[PDB]
Amino acid sequence: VPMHPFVKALQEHFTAHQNPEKAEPMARYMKNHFLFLGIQTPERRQLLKDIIQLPDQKDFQIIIRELWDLPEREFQAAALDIMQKYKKHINETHIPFLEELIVTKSWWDSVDSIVPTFLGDIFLKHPELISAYIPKWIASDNIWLQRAAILFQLKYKQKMDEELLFWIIGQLHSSKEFFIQKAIGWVLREYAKTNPDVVWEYVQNNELAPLSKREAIKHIKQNY
DNA sequence: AAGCCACCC
DNA sequence: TGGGTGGCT
């Protein structure tokens, strides 16, 4: 049971609008790792908007963690919507907090929402901190921290640290894990929108799982 | 906005 | 494999 009145209110309001018919397919979509109330994103954001109609910033970590601790997945999704509203107050001191979120109730929906936006932004401002985290994440054998190392630069475009990206990928290219092979393909394909020659040269000269290579070049292969 | 693509199998 | 699909940059 949540301490914070905001979370108590969100819990009651979400629960009052649950849809058991939708909960089953939503749960199986996520391989039944989580219970669902059965509330999709548009309705979930409207219900959150209801309750906000914003807690002090000193409460934001308390609120997020309380939501993270609740069983139904919509509360973690709502927690990430809430964290967006505190964007300007999130900085390098929050990396360990974000790490905890990544490795707790982990799946692609939370991790892909946390990493290219919040960690991406932090490391753009503090690139001198990357070596304190990225190698650690790679060495952790936690696939979500590994996916975090791969994807924190996903949205960088011209800001991409190419040599860092390629080093991270080389460290993880031998992973058997689908979510790692796919993340490698994804980030290379995305970066190829900005710097296609360099992604082509990388893929032609460095070992990748076939899934990763195929995904990387599927929109530039017709140019070479 | 919506063009793109995570996920699913 | 690539269509179905819901949501993000």
User: What CATH number does domain A1-224 carry, 1.20.1070.10, 1.10.150.120, 3.30.360.10, 1.25.10.90?
Assistant: 1.25.10.90
Q: Which nucleotide is nearest to A193 (CA to C1')?
A: B4
Tell me the CA distances in angstroms from A4 to A55, A63, A64, one per residue in order: 10, 7, 10
User: Among A114, A22, A42, A46, which Cα is nearest to A76's?
Assistant: A114
Is A224 near strand B, with its CB below 7 A from some atom of it?
Answer: no
Is A182 near strand B, with its CB below 7 A from some atom of it?
Answer: yes
Neighbours of A101 (CB within 10 A): 23
Neighbours of A173 (CB within 10 A): 16
- The residue type of A46 is Q
Resolution, rounded to a tenth of an Å? Answer: 1.7
Per the structure, the residues numbered 7 to 66 in protein chain A that have their CB within 7 angstroms of any atom of strand B are 28-29, 31
Cβ contacts of A50-54, under 8 Å, gap ≥ 24: A50/A13, A51/A6, A51/A9, A51/A10, A51/A13, A52/A85, A54/A85
Neighbours of A136 (CB within 10 A): 12
Percent of chain A as helix, strand, coil, to the nearest 5? 70, 0, 25
Find and give the residue nearest to C5, measured CA to C1'. Answer: A29
Q: How far is the CA of A114 from the C1' of C9 (A)?
A: 14
Tell me the CA distances in angstroms from A163 to A12, A36, A53, A76, A153, one per residue in order: 48, 41, 46, 34, 12
d(CA A180, CA A224): 26
